[PDB]
Symmetry: D3
Subunit: 173 residues, 6 copies
């Protein structure tokens, strides 16, 4: 339906708030980010494929495309604000009322248990670490917490199959 | 303290979300909006003064300067998102923890009972309405809803002393 | 590999040129556009699914994700410029030199024969038509031509299953 | 009156020209700046309050709100340009013709003699210094001059009560 | 000298203020404008050549390039502000102290007597009118006044040779 | 003709793509760049004049104004993309079909043989180098390659007369 699409297209206009709070001049939109997660999810899926780890690619890509979809209505409430706002409670609600067809993908994603759910989570973090890397090259000097994003990925089983990649990333540091 | 000032200066960086969601190019920041509320509050207290309506101007101006201060942390969570997000609960928390010295000003502003409180509330809406007016001249054609804030103002006792001004405003549409 | 991902991420920075030439302020990025294509592809896929038309969703989503990938190097050369530049020849080249793993998806996409290929093409054109619609609500009045993409969609067999939707779209103008 | 307010709101749209000349991407508007001045003035007034220095806060806040009001018409003519244009003479004129009701506040502010006038001047400069600080964190490296405004503040009697604070500020450099 | 060139390049960063005041969000820079004046000057000069009117093209092109050069220091102070600021006085000063080598071109330009001086003045106005045209297509609806510059052009002798063109321009409204 | 002028005015809207790819936030337009080339060409012409090297200044200035004119149609296709696109072939075509009157100024410029051709080429690069310099002051740290344009300049005979200037430029790095 046209009304749903027009709604999700608001993501092209919504900024990724963390960057603004860090003084990043023209930050990427939530949609730019979502594209990045989707692409990294695709690329990583192939790597996992040829390393013996089988992944339900379809589910993965759908999960990457829809993972931040609730923000089309509640916006990318930054982590710094989440000490005062329950963004999680809000997301579930929106998915249950506005995006019921995607609530299963959302629910599984939050659980971060399945191979697909962990992949998207890793793609989410990599797009960010690497986006931070870019903004650093642009001159921003307060993109400080990366050893804890890298470390957050390391805490996921699925990372075991990607250690060499995550090593190249931390090497950009 | 410098830390606090640096924190509130974030307002210059955070956009007024309602405009973004409506597709407005280069929307004003929260600080831009706050200045306007501060000015209109000044001007309107002036008018109330010479019409026999007693106003604690000092408290009013303070209230106007601090009214959206919590957003320095939680951002300008749009109305469209407040169906899933309790923004007011979040604001009270930030004020209680991060701006305890302004909690009472905030608390009185939320109650919208006292003359000062309703004045700032009226200034807040007028800035917005007049801002929607300006963006329409820029070419945006979906800010229509914003003009029903005139009716919200009319439901406040204090507006009884400003009727004339509210109608000039409505005539701008 | 990190080098590939960083490259594709350039898409978040490159603008969709047609909008600039038409004078739109702050035009979407190629990545914004791609995300949209990917979402519409998802949504339409499931519409086709429960209408008897079988779609290899995995291939479709992958196809939508990488359809404009060559632009990460070529940039979104506008249609007005393609009378002097062979964007098609340049794309193919990028894809078999830089993106050989995606050359098949690209090649099938260009042929616009398979159900998936036509679906992505339709997603591509709808995102744009709907994007033009949004910019018009912003005030831009010379995006008229963009609406004749509805006819371009009608010329594809797969649209046969979407007539009701296409009607709602054209109804927006 | 609506016309006046609409005029003052022009400040949301005008840049603070010093940043532009120095190459800063998206510089704050004059209204962004004013709000900061108003806030710092509020904060500093409380500090002065509990340190034995009585301040007429109401006048101080009005003064901060109105201090750059003439730029709504003349724009924030940069210091580098003032060697060829008498901004001061321009400001007074705009204030007597267009803002006669704020001329006294402006006149006192320019004299920088009274406690309130020096407070607002101190707020004006702290906002700027802190703003320069923020832009340096974004990568701009030619804002060094802006830091010698600490010395300009030291030359004001009122600073005597704020030694500790301006120490912390110069410490940020 | 490098210092001079770096100074004039500031024109790439400074906005043409009239547009900002009128609410046009991403206004051209003074350098954008100057390039247009230079191009129109070139184009018209050729038309004038084929029409019997001989022009000192070299002088005209230099005059077009240098005409707003003083703004590199004084900024494009808007017409609405020139009721309170003598922009002309300031311009001559800059040219005398900073651009002595270009003072003659400036002086002759302001006199608007010679064929070259009038040509640049016409070019200056045409770029502006055509620029207002483009911003109206973008949705701005308060640039009406800018069209009365066609009349200002008619008052110049040289226009006599360009009637047909001025008609095509006025026809765009 | 009004159609031609409007076309070339597109240059004000089109970004210089190299900067974008490098992460520069607000890049200069092609028009901004052309103005700078036009100014530097003027300034250097005078220098050459008083050093015994005679230059057809009229041709030089015309050549600097239209040197990147084809980009009004094909855009500023970056150097990084030219391994896949033949920008040169594309430019010549546009000039032959759309700018026939400026074709020989274009062809001479490309040959980089005549004093005027080499002067514009040197202005072209100097503007870029100095533009790179400015962006580095803004915080961008990956513009290093752009400084090897000094060596490209040295390869042109005409530079023999400018050694001292080139030394001041390289001195800025
Ligand atoms: Ni995400
Ligand atoms: Ni508010
Ligand atoms: Ni596409
Ligand atoms: Ni100020
Ligand atoms: Ni001009
Ligand atoms: Ni060039």
């Amino acid at each position: 339906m046209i009304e749903k699409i027009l709604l999700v297209q608001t993501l092209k206009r919504l900024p990724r708030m963390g960057w603004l709070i860090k003084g990043v001049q023209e930050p990427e939109s939530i949609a730019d980010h979502s594209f990045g997660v989707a692409f990294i999810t695709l690329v990583l899926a192939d790597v996992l494929e040829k390393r013996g780890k089988r992944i339900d690619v379809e589910k993965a890509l759908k999960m990457a495309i829809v993972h931040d979809l609730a923000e089309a209505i509640i916006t990318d409430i930054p982590l710094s604000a989440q000490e005062f706002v329950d963004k999680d409670k809000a997301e579930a609600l929106v998915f249950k009322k506005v995006f019921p067809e995607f609530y299963e993908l959302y629910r599984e994603y939050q659980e971060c248990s399945s191979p697909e759910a962990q992949l998207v989570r890793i793609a989410d973090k990599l797009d960010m670490i690497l986006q931070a890397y870019q903004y650093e090259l642009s001159g921003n000097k307060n993109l400080d917490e990366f050893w804890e994003a890298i470390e957050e990925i390391k805490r996921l089983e699925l990372s075991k199959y990607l250690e060499d990649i995550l090593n190249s990333v931390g090497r950009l540091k």
